[PDB]
Design a protein around this ligand. Structure first.
Ligand SMILES: O=P(O)(O)OC[C@H](O)[C@@H](O)c1cnc[nH]1
Ligand SMILES: O=P(O)(O)OC[C@H](O)[C@@H](O)c1cnc[nH]1
Ligand SMILES: O=P(O)(O)OC[C@H](O)[C@@H](O)c1cnc[nH]1
Ligand SMILES: O=P(O)(O)OC[C@H](O)[C@@H](O)c1cnc[nH]1
Ligand SMILES: O=P(O)(O)OC[C@H](O)[C@@H](O)c1cnc[nH]1
Ligand SMILES: O=P(O)(O)OC[C@H](O)[C@@H](O)c1cnc[nH]1
Ligand SMILES: [Mn+2]
Ligand SMILES: [Mn+2]
Ligand SMILES: [Mn+2]
Ligand SMILES: [Mn+2]
Ligand SMILES: [Mn+2]
Ligand SMILES: [Mn+2]
Ligand SMILES: [Mn+2]
Ligand SMILES: [Mn+2]
Ligand SMILES: [Mn+2]
Ligand SMILES: [Mn+2]
Ligand SMILES: [Mn+2]
Ligand SMILES: [Mn+2]
Lengths: 184, 184, 184, 184, 184, 184
């Protein structure tokens, strides 16, 4: 089983993260940000990873520094879990709906970081969560993990539906790229 | 008296609902969402139904899952109260103002679900309540009850006035369609 | 083997339907509408289902009531064949060409009905079949089965080619979503 | 193992080609055109075919006649390797990135030739290779093999990145369509 | 060492301020406004001033009166610390980035107050802090200190990044203008 | 003296690089690309670094793979030379002309990679060198070194003048950011 780990402490935040790439979908996510915990459960449920996050930070300023440090920690742990990368599929591709929304995702585990982001989120807040932090989460994840990632919206109107469909399609495309390629 | 009931429990919410179609306007509505309780009182007061709702949920994420599960429960209870549908008017139609706002409603108790929605709500929050949830409430209600519904705005500026006039006109059109047609 | 059945008789039509989700591609389709029989054979041939339809109706008015009642019967039989839905893939996705035409399909077996339809069919009749009935067929199927469905055109000019490519891509995406997920 | 062969000699060129559809990714490509050799290596590496090309021609006029005759020879050898086409998947579909570029490919091994081409290459030369020859290569390949092919660009800026991503996505979609379908 | 002081009490607020122009970067900032404390720490860290603020006010109306009175107090203390202004550089100029944002600042310690402000902040709230108060802060500071100030945005998208880059560039330009000019 | 080193060998290229941050302007640059050697001499001459590059590659395809691998090696060696980064200026800023051209540069040695690129180069080739490789050079350098970089054109017409003025302004801004800050 490919298991990666990371711990990071600064003057703003304290973060611990653990990821299993050959899991059964166990989730235990307790950051300081309740809506982000709901999205990280989708990564376990539709990708079948084991995911565990614990974090405390400076949320009386805002949620920005806690959102950034958690995303950096997940990228580092994924790069440690993958290792040599011998014998994997390496590419993944999927489109996923939630009622009237639909999002398309493709990625490549290349060693070269890049983000292409093309979403149109029509409100500024979902509950207490700020909607500019969705794009900042994915940009910090690709910088520490070294992946090429493209995200593109086909339709949708409700803001809760659009974000949750992104995290569903991302989970299924990442599951495809990390599985072993039994050859032709 | 035509009385319908429903109870639904999931990992997000716990909901109980009871509706009387031949009532005197008794209201007892205690969801977790205070502005939605104020709108459900209009359904009892202007339609003369008896309406009772009790709900608890996961409102520290947001109000979305609690708003959706309550609406599904009301649609199921209405379909159980109606039964065979022998001898009713079946169609209803009404327009209702509140100061400078005016909304037109027509519906048909057909067995075929459809929503046509045409409102223009100019702010994002009324009190703590999110304004995209008005359209999600009516879409969940027509899917479990099987009704054809059309809603169209003629004028209006204040957001509180526009939503409360929708729930007034809906109540008077539903009262017309469920009453017995003493024949010509 | 997951097998679903339905019989419906009204003052307009008489319909019998049977579907096997673990089939070998046996087709026996005899509605009153010859072009619709040719499309239902594609569902058996490219999805590997067993499909059987028998229908008579009031085709001297037009084909509308017979087209609607057959589609409702197929949705009910699919919902009975699926049952609990334990252990399936649940999502499906595919794009299919026929000469110069190309159509993209994605779906989710959710319990929440919705149709997104985006085709541009350039003539009014193919043989004797009316081209507005393509959209009415898919809307009746999602209302009884409870599925989320999105259909989108990428290119194409000939009307026979565009409709037949829709039914090919739909068959391959439905085969993906009903198969058992041997886990990671 | 399905192996196809072809030899063609005219007053312009001399060409020999050999392809294995059940290979391990062995490449030995020596045409007179160095950039085209680099693209043919991608077909072996990402599709897992065995590919061997040897060619000499009249490259002091230009590269046009050598580029056309090699493409015709590959189409003939693929049609000989496939034979009866009993029991294959027959359809294939994939999207592939390279940094900021992304291209979508779908195809069908039908017996009816057609090309849909939609790329936007922003310079006239990559090294010594002329960029109008990319479209001429794919048009000659579909005429001798008899396949339906669609190619469409989603993003990209660098000319080397756009062409190499086309040959990657084409390789993965062709691998899907030639594999045996173990039935449902 | 050039040290300036100020105390101001009204029926709205109570404010105490102390600034050292020849400091080592010691910060002790406790206003009633948490996001403004985070920006005042940047003034100590990148300009190497010693800065100390203590304030209480009427924040149950809003943050406006507390934001205005703190800014007036800082301008007065800077004018007392500078004194005669013999032998200083008097002018300062700097451009500073933070990820995708970039802001240009130039100023002159002239005795004539003026503000030129050209920022485009795309949301209304960062955490609890209102974004119209950024411009009101700088206008009150130049009126009591008597400085000419110009602020201009070159790029940027995230609201937290744009404001924090303004306070970084302002700190480095003010450090340049208050240092002693060892002559040519 | 802060000295960094790197050696990288792949199936495309062979590269060796050495950089001194406290140098006297000694240059010894022998890649396979003659115009790129002329630009690397500007980095020694105007920034006062010592720079040494040796490379061989696959330039009969094109110059792309050799241009990319050299840029990656320089970024790694700079990150090794900097180390802890205690006591440096960390920011740099400069604008530089060459006849009718003028380019503005600012950067920050942050640990977070980002490139903003805004040039308009009016021809496709300068000598034998391809002009799309200027942007690819700077993107590979910021990914291995972890710097924030912004480049913006103010005027210019001749292609040789525009590129050489970029490399002059970059050299003077990097010299500023790596020097020791004798404190205030
Ligand atoms: O079981 P699902 O994966 O379909 O989860 C849907 C839930 O009800 C909830 O996550 C949701 C419903 N609408 C937005 N979010
Ligand atoms: O008695 P009414 O039905 O007219 O209720 C009006 C109330 O004052 C209140 O519901 C309201 C007034 N304006 C918006 N809402
Ligand atoms: O064998 P296929 O699946 O390619 O069927 C094609 C048939 O010839 C026919 O269905 C058709 C050809 N053009 C439109 N329809
Ligand atoms: O190993 P890869 O498949 O990612 O090959 C990338 C190579 O470095 C090279 O083919 C390339 C890099 N950029 C354009 N071409
Ligand atoms: O050390 P820095 O000056 O780069 O501070 C950056 C911090 O992480 C934080 O202030 C920040 C990061 N993004 C916005 N704010
Ligand atoms: O001495 P300089 O730095 O001005 O170098 C100018 C040279 O003549 C040469 O590099 C040049 C002149 N025009 C373009 N390049
Ligand atoms: Mn940030
Ligand atoms: Mn949800
Ligand atoms: Mn919902
Ligand atoms: Mn009211
Ligand atoms: Mn109808
Ligand atoms: Mn046909
Ligand atoms: Mn030709
Ligand atoms: Mn290449
Ligand atoms: Mn004021
Ligand atoms: Mn910050
Ligand atoms: Mn490259
Ligand atoms: Mn020169």
């Amino acid at each position: 089983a490919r298991i990666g780990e990371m711990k990071r402490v600064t003057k703003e935040t304290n973060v611990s993260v653990k990821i299993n790439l050959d899991g059964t979908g166990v989730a235990d996510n307790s950051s300081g940000i309740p809506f982000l915990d709901h999205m990280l459960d989708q990564l376990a449920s539709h990708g079948l990873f084991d995911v565990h996050v614990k974090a405390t930070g400076d949320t009386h300023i805002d949620d920005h520094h806690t959102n950034e440090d958690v995303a950096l920690a997940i990228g580092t742990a994924l790069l440690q879990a993958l290792g040599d990368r011998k014998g994997i599929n390496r590419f993944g591709n999927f489109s996923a709906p939630l009622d009237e929304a639909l999002v398309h995702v493709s990625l490549d585990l290349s060693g070269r970081p890049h983000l292409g982001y093309d979403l149109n989120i029509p409100t500024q807040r979902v509950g207490k969560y700020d909607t500019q932090l969705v794009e900042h989460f994915f940009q910090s994840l690709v910088n520490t993990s070294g992946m090429t990632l493209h995200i593109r919206q086909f339709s949708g109107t409700n803001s809760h539906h659009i974000i949750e469909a992104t995290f569903k399609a991302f989970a299924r495309a990442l599951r495809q790229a990390t599985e072993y390629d039994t050859r032709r």
